Design an enzyme around this catalytic site. Structure first.
Site, PDB file in Angstrom:
ATOM      1  N   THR A 104      78.761 -59.934  71.973  1.00  0.00           N
ATOM      2  CA  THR A 104      79.964 -60.479  72.591  1.00  0.00           C
ATOM      3  C   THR A 104      79.894 -61.988  72.783  1.00  0.00           C
ATOM      4  O   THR A 104      80.932 -62.617  73.010  1.00  0.00           O
ATOM      5  CB  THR A 104      80.217 -59.796  73.933  1.00  0.00           C
ATOM      6  OG1 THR A 104      79.005 -59.776  74.695  1.00  0.00           O
ATOM      7  CG2 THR A 104      80.690 -58.371  73.716  1.00  0.00           C
ATOM      8  N   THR A 105      78.702 -62.582  72.722  1.00  0.00           N
ATOM      9  CA  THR A 105      78.605 -64.037  72.725  1.00  0.00           C
ATOM     10  C   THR A 105      78.785 -64.600  71.321  1.00  0.00           C
ATOM     11  O   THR A 105      79.381 -65.672  71.144  1.00  0.00           O
ATOM     12  CB  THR A 105      77.260 -64.475  73.303  1.00  0.00           C
ATOM     13  OG1 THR A 105      77.054 -63.842  74.571  1.00  0.00           O
ATOM     14  CG2 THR A 105      77.221 -65.981  73.489  1.00  0.00           C
ATOM     15  N   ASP A 141      75.699 -61.037  79.774  1.00  0.00           N
ATOM     16  CA  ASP A 141      76.637 -60.475  78.813  1.00  0.00           C
ATOM     17  C   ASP A 141      77.837 -61.396  78.652  1.00  0.00           C
ATOM     18  O   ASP A 141      78.471 -61.783  79.637  1.00  0.00           O
ATOM     19  CB  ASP A 141      77.087 -59.089  79.272  1.00  0.00           C
ATOM     20  CG  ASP A 141      77.589 -58.229  78.131  1.00  0.00           C
ATOM     21  OD1 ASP A 141      76.802 -57.950  77.204  1.00  0.00           O
ATOM     22  OD2 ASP A 141      78.768 -57.823  78.167  1.00  0.00           O
ATOM     23  N   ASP A 200      74.041 -51.969  76.698  1.00  0.00           N
ATOM     24  CA  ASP A 200      74.007 -52.630  75.396  1.00  0.00           C
ATOM     25  C   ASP A 200      73.038 -51.923  74.457  1.00  0.00           C
ATOM     26  O   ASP A 200      73.366 -51.638  73.297  1.00  0.00           O
ATOM     27  CB  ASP A 200      73.615 -54.099  75.562  1.00  0.00           C
ATOM     28  CG  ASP A 200      74.786 -54.977  75.953  1.00  0.00           C
ATOM     29  OD1 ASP A 200      75.905 -54.446  76.108  1.00  0.00           O
ATOM     30  OD2 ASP A 200      74.586 -56.200  76.105  1.00  0.00           O
TER      31      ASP A 200
HETATM   32  N1  LIG Z   1      63.098 -61.819  69.068  1.00  0.00           N
HETATM   33  C1  LIG Z   1      64.120 -62.594  68.636  1.00  0.00           C
HETATM   34  N2  LIG Z   1      63.892 -63.696  67.893  1.00  0.00           N
HETATM   35  C2  LIG Z   1      64.896 -64.476  67.457  1.00  0.00           C
HETATM   36  N3  LIG Z   1      66.193 -64.233  67.716  1.00  0.00           N
HETATM   37  C3  LIG Z   1      66.564 -63.159  68.450  1.00  0.00           C
HETATM   38  C4  LIG Z   1      65.525 -62.261  68.963  1.00  0.00           C
HETATM   39  N4  LIG Z   1      66.160 -61.294  69.648  1.00  0.00           N
HETATM   40  C5  LIG Z   1      67.491 -61.552  69.581  1.00  0.00           C
HETATM   41  N5  LIG Z   1      67.730 -62.667  68.869  1.00  0.00           N
HETATM   42  C6  LIG Z   1      69.058 -63.258  68.576  1.00  0.00           C
HETATM   43  O1  LIG Z   1      69.922 -63.227  69.714  1.00  0.00           O
HETATM   44  C7  LIG Z   1      71.273 -63.089  69.270  1.00  0.00           C
HETATM   45  C8  LIG Z   1      72.085 -62.238  70.237  1.00  0.00           C
HETATM   46  O2  LIG Z   1      71.797 -62.640  71.571  1.00  0.00           O
HETATM   47  P1  LIG Z   1      71.990 -61.608  72.786  1.00  0.00           P
HETATM   48  O3  LIG Z   1      72.278 -62.393  74.043  1.00  0.00           O
HETATM   49  O4  LIG Z   1      70.819 -60.659  72.745  1.00  0.00           O
HETATM   50  O5  LIG Z   1      73.286 -60.729  72.397  1.00  0.00           O
HETATM   51  P2  LIG Z   1      74.813 -61.245  72.453  1.00  0.00           P
HETATM   52  O6  LIG Z   1      75.087 -61.765  71.064  1.00  0.00           O
HETATM   53  O7  LIG Z   1      75.579 -59.998  72.822  1.00  0.00           O
HETATM   54  O8  LIG Z   1      74.847 -62.310  73.517  1.00  0.00           O
HETATM   55  C9  LIG Z   1      71.220 -62.450  67.896  1.00  0.00           C
HETATM   56  O9  LIG Z   1      71.959 -63.246  66.969  1.00  0.00           O
HETATM   57  C10 LIG Z   1      69.760 -62.451  67.500  1.00  0.00           C
HETATM   58  O10 LIG Z   1      69.607 -63.068  66.221  1.00  0.00           O
END
Ligand SMILES: Nc1ncnc2c1ncn2[C@@H]1O[C@H](COP(=O)(O)OP(=O)(O)O)[C@@H](O)[C@H]1O
Ligand SMILES: Nc1ncnc2c1ncn2[C@@H]1O[C@H](COP(=O)(O)OP(=O)(O)O)[C@@H](O)[C@H]1O
Ligand SMILES: [Mg+2]
Ligand SMILES: [Mg+2]
Lengths: 538, 116, 528
Positions: free
Chosen positions: C94-95, C61, C391
């Site tokens: 949050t990233t 996170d 989340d």
């Molecule tokens: N199956 C997937 N294929 C491609 N991109 C993904 C997939 N799942 C999540 N993402 C991408 O990951 C990003 C967010 O990363 P994550 O670490 O899950 O949340 P955070 O943004 O809170 O760190 C989103 O912009 C999304 O587009």
């Protein structure tokens, strides 16, 4: 022949850590230099194009703002002349609420030109009398420069237009939204009676949604949660108590004296029955919401839950008084049921969650009420604090407008016209005071010059154009910040206006501070003590 | 004052008993001792607890018959006058218990006598 | 400068002003973004941070990592603040907020270096953000059919997308099904405190379960507890806030007697008070007794003699969840224990879970609460599983509030970048460079996805740009196939408000950072 001994007399009698400064070069020029440096530090935040400053106090607390009073408050100013200037700025903030940076700039310009006049040959007394005469002339002139008046305050659109300029220097990008918000909040307040209270406007800061999502609420918002089980009421009949929600006890000393088994077996049951009777008596009046200022007993909470009563506990007595004002209830000192006049009514009380924080909302529906609350959203605590400062400035501007409704053109138009007419007056006055009067007039140029410098244009061209236009007879022409080249425009059409009281008080306080600084001839500073603050400040 | 001063080693704690007749003392060898104020005789010395005791607590509701002692053995162990035996002991503490407060009793970890 | 025998500010006051301090602020924001850069995407990696006490925190996170980082830079704290803001308002992304803000600042750093007026950059950011938010609201896909099955599928897909970046991504479908089921049973406020999260060491992730009721750890049983039956088939639960102990009637109470008969009467009266409370509880018809206050050994043995279950010192939140599940009411007095204030569950049982004893209240048909029981090999494992489930729960709650979704994988941001570039190509030109810089900065997330996945970011970005230009809105990074794909058809869905809040917070942070021209640091007081 290798050392210079201290002169006999006061030099030898001085303490080990004390400092003595006497004479022009040692005292007056040093004070003028310190005040000029302070003005230079605070200069760059002037005007809509002013830049925010991150100031970190001794407690590692961030302060990103372009408010001169806040910056000076968070700065550890040590030079005593700069201390007088800061005190004058704070007095201006207390009296009006806006114009602190004007006070700094004007005092700095006055002291710089006073140093110039002292260098060219004038005495301190002559400079002081010239400054006072010029201040009197400026105060005489100022009423004649009033362009328009508020002419109404219960409206929303024109009140927002009036308040736009005050909160245009800060949050320059988005001031229309803030103007509308503050105008609505102030119009809810300010009833038929002409008295307007600044403290009746409450600011609630909830983090997460960006400042564009901020709203105004006709009521009060508390960042608390309900004590009981009920979390929403539609026809609230709030009864406010300043006493803890518990059976009152003797103030001397309580001692349950038991002498028989029956008393021991019946005491707790009778106490619980008394609590139930008191709670049911409170509920029978129709009070479906109870607000208390003290702790809540377990049995009292249970019996309140039994009769479906919403409980809110407010620790702060200021919050209790503000809630009483908002709802129209009287804080009862005992736990007796409230009579019909003492029971407050609010059109909706409920528990809600905004972003992350849980809040309790005492919401009205009429466009009225004693207290109005502005809920502020945002992505940063510092940003919300800056928006809160802007809201405070807008509310103070509205209060000033309630006091005096006259307005003067902004953007340096008033300053340039004042400088022109003071110079014209001083050109006719004979004697040595004409130099001081002319320098006082020239000191007004520091406002449009600072505006042009912050805007990013050539200050001299702007000032020359302003003089040309004002000589043509246009008294409402000031700097146009919406241009990449030195340009001017009429500020009456643009709606960029400043309160008459603000200019009057700022000029008076700046002149008083400047002449007070000039009056000092000798300085005797004690050794800086290591005491943990004076006892007056606790 | 009593000023008995019958002791080979130093006294970590000299806790006057709730009953206004006798005193309870623990020497530096980890053995508690009970003295009668009037007569002056040592009623009984409590063995065990090899490291020096550091705190003494009598029963709060008078009952001058049980007490708890703790020291450098990382132990919280309870005695009894009427038998001179360790009726109850505890093991949670791990570092040189300085002071003990009797509620169950809180030592420095709240123990409960009814459940060990 | 000059010594100035008496100085203006206190000694040690450090001030930085001009372009160099703004460039340093941008560099600090870049440094902060670097510390969370590799945590984004299904190929993201965990970060381990150790505090002074020696405890280690492992998290994917962004907000948690930034909070554990002890940032002291005045400009860098803004990124942590906006990460906290995104966590509070949305709970996910949050990233992305930090990456977007830092990329905005990095893109406008060159223009800052030639002395461009910061107000122009701020205005350009504000205009671009308004346009992007409006475009997101316009093109977000929403289904106005109110189909329960379709709503459940949408919630499950959103939860899977929010979960497919953590260590529980292998069981993402199963955990997403739990999360959707748990959220759908909250009544109207979707309060987080009504969802229990219990972490029990031992067992695999597939051993984690969701309890359609309430469950809590056994709480310091007294003597005679083991004689109480540990399973009931239609128990009535008495929720109490009562101390069932032999104790003084009141703290200030004091008994004065002068006869041994009165002494015995007082003793018997105390015993009769306790037994009267116990007899009222027993005759209430309840079989399971839970209290917030301690329950003594005497009461425990009394309930054991009646084949009843007792559990004192229950946590307040556990009692509230038991209320919301069984449907009773917490009573501070037992004088009126009617059937209205008695809870009811189909089956109550005490079982062993990984070397711990837990009480279960299952079979509740009208429960308004849940209880997650998480299994793992370490406490940090369970903590990060809880963070991921939090989340997912926040995402599902927001989707319940409004089911407006956009495709993930950077597709939405590529569309936004194309739209913003198209807009910027039709303006005077001083704002055009800044709006184009904003559009280019919007490309950071797909590029970061490719970098984390080991891709070739340039080729994927070129293909995405060409596909978006030639037609196609929901084309994003396909992590598995080393290529691009229509992410809407791949069920990579995010709520629109996630990106809306991310863009708003990032733009606000960038504007605030740019608007600062001078930084002043007062000397520290009471250094100690
Ligand atoms: N199956 C997937 N294929 C491609 N991109 C993904 C997939 N799942 C999540 N993402 C991408 O990951 C990003 C967010 O990363 P994550 O670490 O899950 O949340 P955070 O943004 O809170 O760190 C989103 O912009 C999304 O587009
Ligand atoms: N839109 C505008 N165009 C030009 N000048 C403006 C505009 N809005 C405000 N000003 C000028 O800015 C000054 C306010 O500066 P400010 O930062 O508020 O300092 P202070 O808080 O001390 O008044 C006013 O004198 C006004 O003339
Ligand atoms: Mg102002
Ligand atoms: Mg995510």
């Amino acid at each position: 022949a290798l050392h210079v001994p201290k002169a006999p007399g006061f030099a030898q009698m001085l303490k080990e850590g004390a400092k003595h400064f006497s004479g022009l070069e040692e005292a007056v020029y040093r004070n003028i230099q310190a005040c000029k440096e302070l003005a230079q530090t605070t200069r760059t935040a002037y005007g809509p194009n002013g830049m925010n400053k991150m100031v970190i106090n001794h407690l590692e607390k961030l302060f990103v703002t372009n408010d001169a009073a806040t910056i000076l408050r968070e700065l550890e100013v040590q030079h005593p002349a700069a201390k007088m200037i800061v005190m004058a700025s704070h007095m201006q903030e207390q009296e009006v609420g806006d114009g602190t940076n004007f006070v700094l700039v004007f005092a700095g310009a006055l002291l710089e030109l006073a140093e110039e006049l002292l260098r060219i040959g004038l005495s301190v007394s002559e400079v002081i009398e010239g400054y006072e005469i010029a201040c009197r002339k400026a105060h005489e002139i100022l009423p004649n420069l009033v362009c328009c008046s508020a002419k109404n305050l219960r409206d929303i659109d024109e009140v927002s237009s009036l308040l736009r300029t005050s909160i245009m220097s800060k949050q320059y990008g988005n001031e229309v939204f803030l103007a509308k918000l503050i105008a609505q909040a102030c119009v809810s307040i300010f009833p038929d009676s002409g008295h307007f209270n600044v403290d009746n406007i409450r600011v609630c800061k909830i983090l997460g949604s960006g400042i564009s999502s901020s709203s105004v609420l006709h009521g009060m918002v508390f960042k608390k949660e309900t004590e009981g089980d009920v979390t929403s009421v539609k026809d609230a009949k709030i009864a406010v108590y300043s006493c803890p929600f518990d059976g009152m006890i003797t103030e001397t000393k309580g001692t349950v004296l038991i002498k028989t088994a029956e008393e021991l077996m019946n005491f707790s049951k009778g106490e619980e029955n008394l609590m139930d009777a008191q709670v049911k008596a409170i509920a029978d009046t129709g009070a479906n919401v109870v607000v208390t200022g003290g702790k809540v007993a377990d049995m009292a909470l249970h019996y309140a839950n039994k009769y479906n009563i919403m409980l809110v506990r407010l620790n702060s007595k200021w919050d209790l008084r503000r809630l009483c004002k908002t709802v129209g209830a009287t804080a009862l000192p005992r736990l007796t049921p409230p009579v019909l006049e003492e029971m407050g009514h609010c059109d909706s009380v409920y528990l809600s969650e905004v972003g992350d924080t849980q809040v309790v909302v005492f919401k009205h529906e009429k466009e009225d009420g004693a207290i109005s609350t502005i809920v502020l959203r945002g992505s940063t605590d510092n940003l919300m604090d800056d928006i809160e400062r802007a809201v405070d400035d807008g509310v103070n501007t509205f209060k000033v407008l309630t006091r005096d409704k006259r307005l003067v053109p902004g953007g340096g138009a008033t300053e340039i016209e004042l400088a022109k007419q003071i110079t014209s007056y001083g050109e006719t006055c004979p004697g040595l005071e004409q130099y001081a009067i002319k320098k006082f007039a020239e000191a007004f140029e520091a406002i449009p010059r600072a505006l042009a410098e912050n805007s990013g244009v050539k200050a001299n061209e702007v000032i020359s154009k302003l003089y040309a236009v004002h000589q043509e007879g246009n008294k409402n022409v000031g700097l146009d910040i919406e241009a990449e080249v030195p340009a001017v425009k009429d500020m009456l059409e643009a709606g960029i206006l400043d309160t008459y009281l603000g200019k009057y008080w700022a000029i008076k306080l700046a002149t008083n501070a400047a002449v007070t600084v000039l009056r000092v001839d000798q300085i005797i500073m004690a050794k800086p003590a290591g005491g943990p603050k004076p006892p007056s400040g606790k | 004052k009593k000023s008995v001063a019958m002791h080979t080693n130093y006294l970590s704690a000299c806790s006057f008993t709730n009953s206004d007749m006798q005193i309870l003392t623990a020497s530096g060898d980890g053995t508690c001792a009970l003295w009668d104020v009037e007569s002056g005789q040592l009623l009984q010395s409590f063995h065990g607890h090899g490291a020096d005791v550091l705190c003494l607590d009598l029963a709060p509701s008078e009952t001058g018959n049980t007490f708890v002692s703790g020291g450098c053995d990382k132990k919280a162990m309870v005695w009894d006058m009427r038998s001179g035996q360790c009726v109850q002991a505890f093991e949670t503490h791990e570092s040189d218990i300085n002071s003990v407060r009797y509620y169950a009793f809180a030592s420095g970890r709240l123990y409960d006598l009814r459940a060990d | 400068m000059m010594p100035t025998p008496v100085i203006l500010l206190k000694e040690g006051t450090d001030s930085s002003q001009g372009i160099p301090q703004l460039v340093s602020n941008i560099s600090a924001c870049q440094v902060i973004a670097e510390a969370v850069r590799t945590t984004l995407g299904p190929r993201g990696m965990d970060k381990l941070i150790v505090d002074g006490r020696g405890k280690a925190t492992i998290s994917n996170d962004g907000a948690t990592i930034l909070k554990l980082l002890d940032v002291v830079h005045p400009a860098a704290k803004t990124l942590v603040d906006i990460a906290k803001s995104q966590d509070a308002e949305v709970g996910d992304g949050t990233t992305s907020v930090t990456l977007l803000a830092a990329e905005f600042l990095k893109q406008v750093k060159p223009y800052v270096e030639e002395g461009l007026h910061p107000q122009i950059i701020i205005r350009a950011f504000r205009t671009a953000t308004q346009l992007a938010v409006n475009k997101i609201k316009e093109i977000a896909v929403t289904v106005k059919k109110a189909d329960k099955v379709e709503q459940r599928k949408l919630l499950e897909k959103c939860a899977m997308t929010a979960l497919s970046s953590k260590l529980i991504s292998q069981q993402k479908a199963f955990f997403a099904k739990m999360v959707v089921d748990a959220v759908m049973m909250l009544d109207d406020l979707l309060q987080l405190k009504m969802i229990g999260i219990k972490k029990v060491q031992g067992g695999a992730l597939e051993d984690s379960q969701l309890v359609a009721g309430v469950a809590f750890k056994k709480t310091f049983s007294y003597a005679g507890f083991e004689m109480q039956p540990k399973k009931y088939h239609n128990p009535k639960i008495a929720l109490l806030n009562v101390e069932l102990e032999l104790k003084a009637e009141k703290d200030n109470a004091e008994i004065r007697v002068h006869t041994v008969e009165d002494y015995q009467a007082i003793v018997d009266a105390e015993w009769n008070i306790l037994y009267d409370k116990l007899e009222k509880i027993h005759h209430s018809g309840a079989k399971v007794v839970l209290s917030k206050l301690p329950i003594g050994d005497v009461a425990t043995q009394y309930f054991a003699d009646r084949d009843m279950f007792c559990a004192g010192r229950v946590p307040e939140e556990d009692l509230k969840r038991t209320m919301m599940a069984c449907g009773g009411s917490i009573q501070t007095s037992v004088n009126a224990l009617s059937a209205d204030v008695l809870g009811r569950c189909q089956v109550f049982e005490e079982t062993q879970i990984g070397g711990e004893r837990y009480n279960f209240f299952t079979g509740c048909p009208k429960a308004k609460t849940c209880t997650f029981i998480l299994r793992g090999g370490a406490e940090q494992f369970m903590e990060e599983t809880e963070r991921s489930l939090h989340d997912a729960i926040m995402i599902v709650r927001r989707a319940i509030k409004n089911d407006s979704v956009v495709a993930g994988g950077g597709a939405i941001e590529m569309e936004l970048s194309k739209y913003l570039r198209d807009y910027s190509r039709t303006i005077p030109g001083k704002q055009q460079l800044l709006i184009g810089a904003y559009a280019k900065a919007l490309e950071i997330i797909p590029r970061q996805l490719c970098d984390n996945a080991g891709f070739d970011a340039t080729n994927i970005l070129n293909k995405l740009r060409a596909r978006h230009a030639q037609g196609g809105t929901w084309y994003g990074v396909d992590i598995n196939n080393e290529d691009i794909a229509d992410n809407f058809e791949a069920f990579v869905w995010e709520p629109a408000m996630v990106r809306i809040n991310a863009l708003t917070a990032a733009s606000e942070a960038a504007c605030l950072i740019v608007s600062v021209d001078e930084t002043i640091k007062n000397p520290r007081s009471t250094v100690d």
